[PDB]
Every structure is written in C-alpha cells, then in structure tokens.
Amino acid sequence: AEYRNWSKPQCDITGFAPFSKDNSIRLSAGGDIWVTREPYVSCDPDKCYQFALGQGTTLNNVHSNNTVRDRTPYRTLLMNELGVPFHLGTKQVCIAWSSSSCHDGKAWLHVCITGDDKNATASFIYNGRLVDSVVSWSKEILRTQESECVCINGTCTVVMTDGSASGKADTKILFIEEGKIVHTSTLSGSAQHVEECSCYPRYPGVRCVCRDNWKGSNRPIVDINIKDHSIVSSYVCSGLVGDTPRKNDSSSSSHCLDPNNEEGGHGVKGWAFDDGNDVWMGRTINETSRLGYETFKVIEGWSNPKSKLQINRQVIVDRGNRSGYSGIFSVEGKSCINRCFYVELIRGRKEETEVLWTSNSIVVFCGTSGTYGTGSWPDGADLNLMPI
Amino acid sequence: AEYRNWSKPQCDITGFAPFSKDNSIRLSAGGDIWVTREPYVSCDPDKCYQFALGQGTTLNNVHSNNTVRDRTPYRTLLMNELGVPFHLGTKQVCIAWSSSSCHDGKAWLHVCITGDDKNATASFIYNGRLVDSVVSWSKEILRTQESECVCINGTCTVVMTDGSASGKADTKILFIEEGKIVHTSTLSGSAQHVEECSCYPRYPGVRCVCRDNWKGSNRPIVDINIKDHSIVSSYVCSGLVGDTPRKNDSSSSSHCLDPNNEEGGHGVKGWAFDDGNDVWMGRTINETSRLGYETFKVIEGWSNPKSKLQINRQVIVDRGNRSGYSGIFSVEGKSCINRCFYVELIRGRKEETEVLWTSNSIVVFCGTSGTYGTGSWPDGADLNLMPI
C-alpha cells in the first residue's frame, strides 16, 4: 500500500452522470434511519464512503425534535460505504459538529471538532487512533470543511476557521502527516471570508472553493502548496456566481480578487473547479434560498470576471424541490482524476413545518467524458405523511 | 486476480435443484424490508449476489403506496450477498430504474439507467467508480437487461433498447472494458423486437434469450461475438414457447427466424439456453398472465420449430401462485459452466388489491447433473394480513 500522489491530469468533463442516492428520508418513514446534516463523500483507493454529522438520534424518535440546531454534544461523524443509508449499524467514527475526512492511500484521516462554542476542541484521528488535537484559537466556533480533506504523498491538508460569521475571522490551513499536525499556515491573499471549503488535488498542490459568509456572493479560492506551506487566495472570476444568497443572472457581478458586496451576508457550502480557463460549478437554482440545484460550465469563467457565458447546464434537483450543501470529491480513474459532487437534500425545520425535525438525504454525480440526458432527483419524501 | 474467460464446456444438466429463497415479503410484515422489482442474481469468482431495483422505500412505510410504477427518481440498484434479504443495511450501488451487472474476474460492472423517459442517462460503474455514460439515443425509455451482463477476457457486453414498446425500436450491444464503452454494435439479423435479454457465456462468445414485446410470443436470440463485435439474431425454434402472453400448447406455434404473431403484444422477461440441439427453458405455467412457473427441456427444441416434445418438467412455483420475471445466470464450476435462474415473485398491485404496494421476493435454482424431486416455492405471504 502506497501513498496517493494524484499525479495524473484531470479527466475530460462534458458534464455529470448519476452516481448515488440514499433516499434516507423516504426510508425513515418505516425504518430506523439517522437524523443528520452537513454530509459528504470521500473514497479510499478501492471504494467510496458517505459521511454526515448525526444528531445522536434516529428520525422516528423523540430526540429528533429541535435538531435544527448546528452544535450539540450528541453529534458524531457517521461513516458508511456509499449507498448504505445511515442505519443503526452505522459507525460513528468520532464526536463532531464539524468535520473533514480523507484517505492518503494507507489509512483514514478524520478531523473532528466538538465542544463549547467559545472553546471548541478539534481531534485528529488517523488509522483508528488519536494522534493530535488543537484548541480553538480565536474562541468563536472553530469549524471546518464539511467535505473531504486532500492528501498528497502522505501530507494531508485541511482548512479551518475560527472567528466571526459576518465579519473578519481567522482562517488557518493545517498540514497533517500520519495524524500529526506538522505545520500550520495562516490565511493569506485577497480572500476576505472563507468557510467550508471544497478542496481537491490539483497536482502538485490543492485547490479549494469556499463560502464567504460576509461580503461576497462569489466563492473564494484558496491555493495550498503542499511542499512549502505557502498559501494564495482569491475569488471565482465567473460573472455567474455560486453562493446563495445572490443577485439574479442579469443583475449579478463578480471580481477575481474581492467580495462583490452583492447580498453577501450568509452563504451555503458549494464547490467549483477549473478546466483550462473555464469553470465547472453547481449552485442552488433559486437565488435567495436553498431550492433546486444546477450545474454548468462558464466559458472563460475561471479567468474572466465579466463572462456570463454558461454551457452544458444540468438540473440536478428541480427548482421546486429542496437542496442545500454541496461539495467536491475526487476519484482516481486509470489515466486521470475525476471530479464528482454530492448534494444535501435538507428536509424539515425551519423551512418546512409539517414535522419537528431537520434531516437530509443525499444525491451524488460524477464527471463524465461520455454523454448524458436529463432528470431531477429530489428527496422524494412526503412530510405530510411522515412520523407524526 | 485474473480475467474470467469462461473457457469451459457447459455442465451436464438433467434439471434444476433448489439454490436460494429470501422470503422478502413474508419478512416485511414484521421488519423493514425494501420494496423492489426486476431482481436478478450474478456472482463473482467466489460467491453470489442478489440484485433488484428498489422503490426508495421499505414496505411498512407510507412511500410504498403506488410503487406499481416502473420509473421514479427514487429507484436504485440494490445489492446483497445471495440469501440476505434487502434490509436497511443494503447497499444501493447506483441510481437505476433499469440495470445490468457483471463481474469480469477483477471487479464489478454496473450499467445503471435513470432520468427522464425521453432523455434517460445510463451510467457505467466499474470497480467503485464512474468510468463512462451514454445518453438515450432514440429518446423513448432507454432500458436494458434486468439481469447479469457477461464479460470475457475483460471485455463485457450488455444489450440495451431505446424506442417503441409495441413497434420497431433501436437495440444496441455495448462492449465495455474496465468501465469504458469501447465499441457499440447495433442490432442486426432476423430478431424484430428485443428487450431484457438473459445473456450467458457460450465461449468464445455470448448468447441472450430475450423478450419481444411486439409481434412474438417466441423468445428472440441474439449472438454477440466478443472479439469482432459482429451480431447475429433470431428466435427460439421450439414449438413450445417461453414468452407470456401466448397461445396454449396445442394452439401455439413458432419460427426460428420471425415473430410468430401469436398474442405477441406485451411479454415478460424470461430465459432459455441450448444443449446440443435441445433447449432448456422456464416460463409462467399460465399462458395469459404471470402465474406459476415451470421449467422443461424441449427435445430438438433449439433447431426445430415444429418440435413440442418436452421432457424433464419441473414446477418451480405452482399455477395458483404468483410469478414474474426470470433470467439466467452462470456459475463456473471446476470442470464446466453451470446455468442457473431466478424467479421474481411479484405481490401487490395491480393484480392483488388487498394492499397498496407492489413488491417481490425471489427464488433461485441451479443446474444439476445429479437427481431431484418435486415441490413448489411460492412467495408465501398473506396479503390479507399484511401492513394495512
């Protein structure tokens, strides 16, 4: 067993093909399924796994009431093989109301964060054992990616944030080798607010596309150099923007270096990646809320902040159905690295009031150099019928 | 680990011995079992698995209502080891309302089809990753085998159909090597309508026995040449015919080259295989509907369309109990290749109205060169008692 290097060029993408769907919430109307959120997908050399943060409870269960909250002591990182819904035999791999996970080609890394809001602890677990931890540095909700970290030659990188949600915060980028925090670089460059990055291996380094919760509706970009720990940062040029909330297609604008100050308060976790000078990206179809989900390629979208020339649109979830967080993950094909993505289908409170709980199901698509058609893959649960 | 070649002669068959039964529906009266259909069985070099398409729901569950439908976004290919009923820890290995699966002796292939009726996508997943996809070519319900594909020397073949259900349609035969669609041959020969093939390794090529939904009640045969991609096609000569609906034993007839225009509208998935100039085949005992299931050998049945000389009958399911889809699968013994088959035991709507759902259990028999007796292995569930 050797360390992953990801030293392959990126596969040709013409769009995305269906990969996986757990129908979690549909199943939880007759069956004992976890109540969860902030899910993600990472894979080892052999196969793929689905992670989410649990609420220390199942759905048909009295403790599902008020699971609209983001941080409780009862939240754990859940881990199943992709396709297995989160049943009672699901492994809680750590305590976490915030996490990131990745395989370096030998073993698993989990970055797990739990504890008081003003004094969170984050634990680094490698190969089934605790190897390190770190305190919250700025004592205001130390949090991280809510999707996969990335490892290269057995140095793993993760991006974490401690500080304000709607002002300046303190973002750091850790380098972890066999569970051991070996360097901490601090956030540098033109990125102003940075959360919940969706990172991927762009050999010989790592690239993330994040969430600015403060002044931007364009997504931040952070570039991690694995060998020398240097950091550069910016935003996704593309005049069509991926955060939510945002302005409309005609009224929106962006900058390659700055927040665009366009509805920038708040955000949603999301992803994009480059392709020469083009950008592939998903986002919620609806501009103000987490409804629907779409993907497309912005031509010149990576290097030109004026371009709003989208091609290869795909409706992942239709505009009248509920969506949420999404993030990248990358799978080594035989010649090249594929890029894929998951979509959190949030059901329940506060937006839907027919029940007392908040939970999700997931959907997953992978890059394809072949061809594809159309559809919609919503949650599919009937909340009017659900465990009353 | 080496590629399967199947370069062994076919085992002597004198009939079939019991192999497996999941009692799925009986179990779902006290327990959380998937609602499913269009099931099948394929095996790796070591052991066997049971696949079916799910309805994104369990049985005792409000979302089981109206699962009589064939295509929803919530359907996934389920996969367990043979014998394990489809419980909540069951792996949904892809999104699919139509699928085929096979092992090449190194890894798994899944051919998974989902999306809009008029624009379906089909995804090719090998060794835990998406390697290819293709659009529906004729924009009318691109669909496939609903049983195992076949691989030889690590080229896998699958047969798909896009087009009319009760007229001419467009049938293709894909060649897939490590998940990668490497050739597409188009349907050629005297076969007129072709769906849901039950294929098997007849070294050095592949043979399928299909369903003609249009003008035939005899089953079509398609012969895939793996090395040169050439296709030939026809029908099962045997004057005793395997599709359902059909005419009776005295009134029926067949042709080696053409549909017989005998009740040919509609069909049911089914299987047959050759044995010198004889044909082994199963079918529903009842001629117009999916009740009972039987097997027999038609003497001269492979090469003589006038012969109705059956020997070695076996009642798999008695005529007063419900049956359905069946298909072949092949298992490498030590000296030879065995042929086996599964039978879908459909319960529920529309035919049975004591409940709101449609689901199945399965039964499985394997070829034997030994001896056997008699019985019946129906579903065994009491719908009058079932989750009301």
Next chain:
Amino acid sequence: AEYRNWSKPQCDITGFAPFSKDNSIRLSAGGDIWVTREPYVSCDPDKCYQFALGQGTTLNNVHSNNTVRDRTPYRTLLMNELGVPFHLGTKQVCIAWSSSSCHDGKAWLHVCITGDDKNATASFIYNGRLVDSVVSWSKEILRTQESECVCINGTCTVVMTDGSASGKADTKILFIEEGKIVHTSTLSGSAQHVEECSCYPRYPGVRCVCRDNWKGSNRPIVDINIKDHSIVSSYVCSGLVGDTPRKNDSSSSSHCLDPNNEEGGHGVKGWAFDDGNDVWMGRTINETSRLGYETFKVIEGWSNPKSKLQINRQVIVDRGNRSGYSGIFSVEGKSCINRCFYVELIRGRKEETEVLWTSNSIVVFCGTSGTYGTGSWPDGADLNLMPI
C-alpha cells in the same frame, strides 16, 4: 489453505464451560428476530457459526402463527457467526427444512433438503455454488443430521434417512468431495433406526450418535470409515440412556447392539462421545418430555451396558425450564480436538399456549480440561408478555 485432517488426539475433558448464548427469544420481544428451530453450530478453521432452519418469518410478524410445522417451502438454513442473533441481515444460505453443514478447511459444505414430503430434493452446496443434488430414494421425508457434517482430507461425510418414522427406514451415508457426491454407502450393522446424527472426527474416521425413533431409548452409533466407505453400527452401551422419552434411572436398561424397547417410540436429537471406555453425554433432565438439560460422564459407559455409574454431572438448563435438540461439534485446539455442544431452547406451541408461534434460542458449552462450577442458562423469555 489446507484440508482439515483432524489428526490430533481428543482433548482431556473434565466437563464443560460456557461458550455462547443468543437470548434470541428475549430479543424478539423488541426487535426483528427470525422464528427458527433445529439449530446447530459448526466452525471453520478460524471461527464458529450458528445455523438454524428458519420459518421464512420473524417473530413479531403475522406469519409466525402455526410455525409449529416442520416442513414448509419457506424454510431456509440461516447462518451467522456464533453470538449474532438471527436478525434481518442474516444470510439464508439455502432452502431447507432439513440440513447439515461443515467446513473442510478450504470452503463450506451445506447439505440442504426441501420439497414435497414424498419426493424431497437435497442440494449439495460447496464454496458458494451448487455442485450436486439427489432425489429422495424411498419417497418418505428424506431428512438428515440437523447438526454439522464432518470432513477429513477433503472428503466430507453426511448421514441421511428416507423411510418410516416408527418402523424400518432407509439410511445412507454419503461421501462428498468438493460438493460432489462421490460414493454412497448404505446403513449396515446392528443399528435399527437412525436419525439426526451428531457426528464427530474420531481420526482416521467419523463417529455419530443418533436418534432411534422406533424401538430404542438408547442412542444408536454409526462408524464411518472415510477411506474405504465401510460402515458399522450399534448402540451406546451405557445403562444410563440419552434419548427422550425413556424410563427412569432405576427402571431403565440398555444394550450395546439392540434397541432396548423401553419407551422407544419417538425421540429427540442428542449426542454422546467416547473417552477410552467412558461416555460423555447430555440429555433432557425430564424423562418423558423436553424439559431441562444435563450432562455427565458414565464410567465404563462406552463398553458396558450394565454400568449406571455417572460422574461429573452438570445442569445446563434446570428441570423446570424448556430444552430440546442438542448435537456435538468439534473445534481444533493447538494440540488436540475439543468437543462442544449446543442446546435448542424451544419456546411456544404446542407445549406453551400463551402465544401462537414456535421458535428457539440457543446455548453452547465447550469441553474443558480446567475447572468449572454451576448454574442454569434457560431461555429467559416471558411468554405472558411476548408479542400478543
């Protein structure tokens, strides 16, 4: 991986120590557990498994009504690792209302019998595939061991019976090599009626201690020679006898060669093994019915039909609690072969009428050359409270 030979002397036994208990029925009052009977335990080179025959249903489930019956089409051989109760993820490894299983040191053998009473089929499954089958030869309930078969140098032996339950029947001993029935020897010697043998590896052959349902209350012994297929048979000399029903300790008697004609009608599956000229054996404490369970060593019990000198008694289940079938199984220690045994704890109909079902839990003890004390390990379920 090499073939088991069992070419080690038998471990010193001074009695038995607790090994395993599944509390199956207690668990089935809040949880979905299989309804089962005729259970057993066999182990591979590494670890042990618990088998039973299912009723195609769980306990809290409408199909549990009338599971007092012995042969339905819905019965399957269940297989879990020892300690795991029979939950919904339990593998049904074949169709069977009668079975035997054993590992030859490379793979699993299952001998599975199902079908019409007057025409049963028995299927031989090795290494995940059907390799052979045989018809019922005398068309009256072909049945077998309901405990582990035994393999030596990769020839496996199993004993089967077709014929009368309360008169002469036809007993055969099959030799199976890699799933393939390679010889059939027929029952020879002074044994008159022979069923449900508990066999074990007494190198260089195999020994069984059976159930005579006709004229004996002493258990039959059958000696299988693996290399030359010759058979000899008799009864357990010991003046203290192991079948149930039987006469009392003072009124009982036995013969080394013949049934003792003492309450001999009926029986119960049970076990014994030799130790120089002594016999270790378990039996129901109660003489007429399946209540309590005990073990002891009869001094001179193996070769002397007049001896009723028991030592080293142990109450496995107390006399006021329900017991049932028991059988041997053998585990290779490092220097020697241990002998162990399981006990079926039957609850329900017909004997207990507070419920509608019939099911069991199990308890397991293993030989010890160390020391031990006392207790009782009954089922422990409250039928007055159970799923009404």
Next chain:
Amino acid sequence: AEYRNWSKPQCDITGFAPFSKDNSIRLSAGGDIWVTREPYVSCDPDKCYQFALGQGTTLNNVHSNNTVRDRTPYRTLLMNELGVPFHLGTKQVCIAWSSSSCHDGKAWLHVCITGDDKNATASFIYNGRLVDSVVSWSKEILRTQESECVCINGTCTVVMTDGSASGKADTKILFIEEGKIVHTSTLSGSAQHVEECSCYPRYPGVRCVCRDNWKGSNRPIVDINIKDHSIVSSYVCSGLVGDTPRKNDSSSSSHCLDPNNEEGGHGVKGWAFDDGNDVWMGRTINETSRLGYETFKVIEGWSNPKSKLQINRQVIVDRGNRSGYSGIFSVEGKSCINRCFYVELIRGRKEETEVLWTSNSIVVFCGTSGTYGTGSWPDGADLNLMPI
C-alpha cells in the same frame, strides 16, 4: 502477525481529546438497542472495539424491566467496533456477568464469568475457541476487571476477585498464554481490597488502578511482573482521591500503602496512571454519587500522599449529569503508547424512576500531546419521553 510487546515509552500527555460517543440511549427511543452496563474499550493492532455486558434484551422490550440486577444467566459480553452502537447484529462473544478482553497482537482473549453466585465459572476464550476455564475458588461472586486485560510477548494478565465485598476477599492474578492459564499468582502487598482493575502496559510489566470496596476511598495499585509472576501492591498516594464515595477536597486524605478509612464502603470502577512522579486520573465530580465526571493531573500525585495540587482539569461530563464506571485502555502510537479512557453514562433505576430499566451509553477520550478546550458530553436522553 507478531506479538505485542508495548516496548515503547509512554506518550506525552497534556490532557485528553474527544474520541468516541455512541448516544446508545438516545438511539434506543426509536430503534432496537441493547440494554447494557459495565462497558469498556480495547483495541487490536489495527482498530478499536467497544465491549459491554448485555441484559439479554433490548431497551424497547418487556425484558428491560428490572435490569438493575448485576448477575443474570441472560448477560453476555457484547462486542462492536468503536462507534457502532449495540444493535441487533451485535456479536455476543460469550456468556458473562463479568468480563475482561485483550488482544496480544495475533488474536482476541475474553475472560468471561457466569454461573451461580456461590459457584461461578469463568471461561477463557482465545482466537474463537475455549482453551481453559476455572471455578470460583472462594464461592462468593468470582468477578473481574470490567475493562481490558493486558498482554505482553503473548502472555496475558488478568486480575480476578472472589470473596467479600465489604471485608477481606481473595484476589488472584492469572497469566494466560494463547487462552491457556499458565500461572496463577495470588495478591500480595499492602493493598487490602481490590476489584475491577484498570490495567495498562508499563513495560516490562503491567500496572492496575483498582477499586477498594471496603476501607479505602483512595484507589489500590497492583504491579504485575510478566516474566516472573511476582506481585506488589499499594495505593495511589495523591491526596486528591479517585474512588466514589469519598470526602471533599478539603476534608479528604490518602496514604501510599493503606486504605484511608474515609467513606471507604462501596466504590466505583475508575482509573489512574503515572507520569514520572505525577498522576493523571479521572473521577466523578460529585463525591457521594455517580454524577459528573472530571479528569486532572495531580502534581507529585504519584509519590506524595500529602499533595493536592491539581493541574489541567477537564470536565468530561458536567456535575448535573449522570456518569459511572470508567477504565483505562492503551493504544500503540508510532513512537509511544497513548493512554485513553471510557466513561459509562448510566441511565435508569434505581436513581432515575421515570422508567423501569437500567442501561448506559459511553463516551471516550484519548491522551493528547497537542491542545484542547472545553465542553460536556452527557448521555443526552430524555427519560420523561423514553419508551413508556
């Protein structure tokens, strides 16, 4: 696969980071979870497992009533990978109302005790088979560690106690090699009462920190020499004491050699370990009962019975929430041996009367040479809502 030696120095500890939480009881309000107690955590070379003693029942289940009792025939040692809550597919690895488990780097050892109070049997299971057993020697509740044993060079040591709960009892230390009891040393030294030791590998021997149920509120220490079987014993010097009940921080005192006769009746299982001349230790925050849980380092606490100078306090469970048993376990890092600990969160009778049952959930922390913050990780179940 080689024998564990643990021949590494002990990792630097600055305190403890979160590791694991099963939310067992929260899950059991909608789902079938075991009712359990006296849990623990041990790990093989690769990964960690959570053990507890079951009550032969689930929570929502009629047999959960009166599970306040410590010894029934229906109790088994449960074993899952750490993080998996005790669901119906959980392996009961032996019969036990008292147990200890450990891996020697090749296979598992379980020391399992069950049977009559006045004649208990204890079974030694190694590598999936019974290798030895021993009777209770003093016929008064032979019991053991309720946490992991320790093995070095493939000799495993376990400490057991038979005798009085509130007076002199008979404590022994067994040496077990491949399941085989190879030596028994008897308790020697100044320790007066000794139960439920939390042992760990302090190369070249083993150290335990126990529970004195009689005259001490300071914890006993027992030092096992693996090569020569010699035993020495004493108490934890530290003027801040770890048993419960006890006196307060100002009123308490201790001795390095004797019980302190301070509220010494009763106890609770607990742990401590050394660090030069300092002691790390956890205990219940509340002095008289099992509420809250805390950890700290007593400076000079290992060798100085007058020192009450605590540093590096951490609240594991807050003082208004329920705690219970805790014990050490040790994980081999790459350079050094980490020390971790679990905490039993007991809910139910007798202390809480809103339900009829007694059960637990667990929480687990591991040593860290990094940094950490604060929180509380209580059970989190609402007994006022629980399965009525």
